[PDB]
Amino acid sequence: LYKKAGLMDKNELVQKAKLAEQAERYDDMAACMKSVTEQGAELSNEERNLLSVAYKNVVGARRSSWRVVSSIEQKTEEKKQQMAREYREKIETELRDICNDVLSLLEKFLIPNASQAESKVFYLKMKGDYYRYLAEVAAGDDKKGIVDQSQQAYQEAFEISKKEMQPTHPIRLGLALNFSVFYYEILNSPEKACSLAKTAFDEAIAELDTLSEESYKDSTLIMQLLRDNLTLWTSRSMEVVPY
């Protein structure tokens, strides 16, 4: 504007994203973390975590709005129907922006800068998520193509994490959680879904001896969701966790 290039230092940007979080202003938070990302430095686990939550909440709000409106779109007898149809489309657009914004960050910065496998797995999972959201809202011909960009990501994530990470690890567990949901809600393979969940859950249960006090609340919460899902698939406080 007309400021003198006393821009915010990275440390300061992160202090703001935190402030923005406690103040329930996730647009601000996403913005602060997008900036930090763009500096090109590999993000610390804190920053990475912060970034993830920030966009979980931002994309999340729209997804809720899209589902409310897309529903109302269809509880219609005439003219009001396409009032809703357009509103939905405007929301789909907000969505695709946020999704593509994040997807960019993941391609141009986060995934290439990934040091240890744990981080690659992190960002690949993220990639599958936001490709998945595009898919949820994608057009007829595009969908099939979007939905397996989603799957390729989740998949590579899965493979690395099996070779390289403990099953009690929140990242591997959160990946499991969202992949099994992918198979279920996106591919309608409740069979492949249930397999992923149970295996993931069991292998973690197998090694609860190994789960550390520091990962404990997070991992067990994800395990609990995996298991709560399995009951349902047989017979969202996830927005505050990065995994």
Next chain:
Amino acid sequence: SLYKKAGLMDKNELVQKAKLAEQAERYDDMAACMKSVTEQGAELSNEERNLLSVAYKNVVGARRSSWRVVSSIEQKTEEKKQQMAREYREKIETELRDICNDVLSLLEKFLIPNASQAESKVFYLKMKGDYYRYLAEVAAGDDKKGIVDQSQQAYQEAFEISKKEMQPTHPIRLGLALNFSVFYYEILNSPEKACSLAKTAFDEAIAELDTLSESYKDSTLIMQLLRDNLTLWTSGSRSME
């Protein structure tokens, strides 16, 4: 942006999308719709009036919560980090003032003048007192005295019309009482007038429990709120919804 012809939305399509916005909790969209509707110059219907008030309570409510949250972090830091909390707080105060003002604007240039029945003038006069009161909540020394009095003089005029024209159990009269006492307590640090006003309003509505008939659950809801505030202020944390 500029690439659109004046085939835009009429009052009905605007209102119809206000309601959708509300269902999808996009109170910004909703305030945009109702502002547009208000601006077309006609007196708002009751349905419309409500959509307007809801949308802006929500829009400004969000910023007020944010301000309070950041404002506390500022003080629980008795310290280079405090400066960032302070500046974020100021950025927020800005969003706040814009919102209050372009509402206060719709009230002077449209809503209050268009007000025909006594009941309507009370609603928008309280609304005026309400948003001057949010201004008052964040104002600095110099501007404050007058913002506060803008809030009071509005609350006041609304008060006398409501007592002279409506029933003690009329939720608007009841709701005016609620927010006027909050003014006194929180903005004027006049706790005895606040408590006295809350109690009176409550007592006179107690008297005429004749006047129902299902509004009703709208009347006793505010009555319960007046009691809570009265309890809070006289015993040893007020609510925001």
